[PDB]
């Protein structure tokens, strides 16, 4: 992470800003996945009181 600090106004409002520069992708050779099986079931909220 590249931490940077910048003061906006004569010392008022210090700012801390950071960010990473990276990329992600699930490996797809041809048109088929390579190493993940997406098990896709039915999972109901066991507690119906949740606002959702």
């Amino acid at each position: 992470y590249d931490w940077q600090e910048e003061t906006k106004d004569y010392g008022n409002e210090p700012t801390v800003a950071s960010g990473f520069i990276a990329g992600i992708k699930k490996t797809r050779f041809n048109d088929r996945d390579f190493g993940v099986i997406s098990i896709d079931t039915y999972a109901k909220d066991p507690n119906p009181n949740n606002p959702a």
């Binding site: 906006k8 106004d9 004569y10 008022n12």
Partner: protein
């Protein structure tokens, strides 16, 4: 060497300060100046304790 002399006067500051936490950068005062000059010249005169007689 000079036919003139110019001097300067710096007036006070007058500006509403920024109360609160609103930004102040960008509202800077002018520092108004005033000046005037004096022009130099010479004056001479002569008196004659005249006559040999």
């Amino acid at each position: 060497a000079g036919d003139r002399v110019s001097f300067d006067l710096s007036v006070r500051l007058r500006g509403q300060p920024t109360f609160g936490d609103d930004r102040v950068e960008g509202k800077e005062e002018n520092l108004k100046f005033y000046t005037d000059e004096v022009i130099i010249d010479q004056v001479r005169h002569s008196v004659s304790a005249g006559g040999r007689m």
